[PDB]
């Protein structure tokens, strides 16, 4: 009783740490993900054309699944990315506390990026709490859309819902650690091994996200492969391998339908980021075996998981990527470099007016 | 200065009239449409498995572009379509005045279809004015989604908007004749050559649709190839060849963005009906020449158009379908039978739980 799924997409992964493109894309395939969008907050950061060119070739050499690379907004590169913009997955704005190179000091710098970045290309924003309203204002002033990363709070999701009710062009994603973990789990985690940005919400925050599922456009892991030597405080959790099992469990419990899952892990990611189809690509999952999330998942070099102990009822059994078996019951069979940059495909270009 | 578009999809076409699958799919390619969904209100109607099997083979022999065929809900076939349901584009309910075979006499028959039709498969409804609210109620009682055909009135679009604000699973399409024509054009058309269902709205209806573009999920021609010997009263207009030129004109005027158009003619149709991608398929359009819609478009056997006289600024220049040039500047180059039933493709199946 296996279910055939399409090639799933994770539009928010941090791959360059111990973790690398090869180790990260392996976790992706083990999670049923055939396409990933890597964030620009690496060392060095992807905030210029030379850095993007290098990262794109390192990924094409190490990635086991297909990918696109985000460009990062900085205090100095507004108006300079116009030539390479189309080659990136989009532009990422880090609006809360972050690294010096990706730190935007004023909302004026936000507006300058919204005005300079090509209007047809995606813009993504890490915006927590009131920052969600502020960035929506900037998007309105510039008359363009914006995608809100990892919505984690009732405050945020209800704000987006009000924006959508008024016809504003806003989309948003939600991560599994904000749908299946809460503050009560900070007692079984602590300040270390628990520090995430946005922080884990209250039970009311988790409940609000589930109640407003219709407002959620995409699911995305926000896979941040930090080791526990680091966490125990860099923010982020690993989640590429736990995402689909957790969500399939929710589908088996009647919390959401299979279509809801597929809309949010396939169709909506494609239409928001204009990511191309993957020919002869599919995932096969088994929903008849219940297991408990171990202390660490097999592939992610993070060597730990915040979902340890949770009972799940779904397993990725097989992943075929562009005609080749890429994953089978605990073994990745495509080598580092099988993955391709989807923005270099002819169908991976974002259509624009002349 | 040509713009490359993806394979566009028209999810609402009546092909079996003079018009046939070969003549209709030719108009589709001339309009930049590479995939169509044919409605079941033919003679005979597609309201049983044998009728569907026949229509599917006639289409596979005459269609020049790819297609899927809707099944039609009747007063007698509820609970009988379960075996062939997955092979259809979806289930079409004709809830207003229609033919005897597709006439549903009571809302109880609606509910029986909503309860029997597979829950994962699309259901589409022709519902005008208050019928839109009634069918949304039935969908809620059965805890499933519904797609509203050709929204034409401020009344309807605002009702759907309220449903969406409350998180109800409803999507809707809008036709070009309800965005670019109004009652004032019934003075240059008359009762004959003007009878359409839903009828042409007032200027306030047209304005309401444009103001609530964010509520519109899909565009669709509702191509009804009736001749003027018939109209001058079968309802419907031809529109496969005028759809894209009219919409591209609106994009050039700043009424909507190219992304808005592509969402509504490509991405959203794919995700609502789970229609598969078309490999090596694209359309090339030129937006630098202004022409006037003639008295009749070249390919549609309808031999007339309600948009006669309107000035447009877009032209389909080239259509490539699965690696072959299917249309070029006034000539269709793929023969009848090149088109395929997308539901028989492995990627064209709607995913479902075991
Ligand atoms: Zn973030
Ligand atoms: Zn992140
Ligand atoms: Zn780290
Ligand atoms: Zn696209
Ligand atoms: Zn099994
Ligand atoms: Zn490669
Ligand atoms: Zn209709
Ligand atoms: Zn119709
Ligand atoms: Zn007719
Ligand atoms: Zn689908
Ligand atoms: Zn030209
Ligand atoms: Zn054929």
PDB file of C-alpha atoms in Angstrom, chain B residues 9 33 63 89 106 108 145 161 164 167 185 203 214 217 222 235 238 272 277 288 294 298 304-305 322 340:
ATOM      1  CA  UNK B   9      -4.259  25.600 -19.835  1.00  0.00           C
ATOM      2  CA  UNK B  33      -3.446  26.982 -25.194  1.00  0.00           C
ATOM      3  CA  UNK B  63      -7.304  16.484 -30.618  1.00  0.00           C
ATOM      4  CA  UNK B  89     -10.671  15.700 -15.441  1.00  0.00           C
ATOM      5  CA  UNK B 106     -33.035  18.666  -6.095  1.00  0.00           C
ATOM      6  CA  UNK B 108     -30.345  16.266  -2.454  1.00  0.00           C
ATOM      7  CA  UNK B 145     -13.831  21.565  -1.898  1.00  0.00           C
ATOM      8  CA  UNK B 161     -14.340  36.244  -1.160  1.00  0.00           C
ATOM      9  CA  UNK B 164     -12.272  32.377   1.406  1.00  0.00           C
ATOM     10  CA  UNK B 167     -11.023  29.509   5.253  1.00  0.00           C
ATOM     11  CA  UNK B 185     -22.299  45.804 -25.402  1.00  0.00           C
ATOM     12  CA  UNK B 203     -20.418  47.835 -15.593  1.00  0.00           C
ATOM     13  CA  UNK B 214      -6.971  38.451  -5.996  1.00  0.00           C
ATOM     14  CA  UNK B 217      -7.987  31.560  -9.153  1.00  0.00           C
ATOM     15  CA  UNK B 222     -15.892  28.896 -21.564  1.00  0.00           C
ATOM     16  CA  UNK B 235     -25.894  30.046 -24.354  1.00  0.00           C
ATOM     17  CA  UNK B 238     -16.428  31.476 -28.635  1.00  0.00           C
ATOM     18  CA  UNK B 272      -6.643  22.833  -8.726  1.00  0.00           C
ATOM     19  CA  UNK B 277       3.299  19.235 -16.724  1.00  0.00           C
ATOM     20  CA  UNK B 288       4.467  45.052 -29.991  1.00  0.00           C
ATOM     21  CA  UNK B 294     -12.090  40.698 -36.843  1.00  0.00           C
ATOM     22  CA  UNK B 298      -9.528  32.192 -38.295  1.00  0.00           C
ATOM     23  CA  UNK B 304     -18.143  34.907 -35.209  1.00  0.00           C
ATOM     24  CA  UNK B 305     -16.803  36.600 -32.089  1.00  0.00           C
ATOM     25  CA  UNK B 322       6.040  18.333 -26.497  1.00  0.00           C
ATOM     26  CA  UNK B 340      -3.052  13.006 -25.689  1.00  0.00           C
TER      27      UNK B 340
END
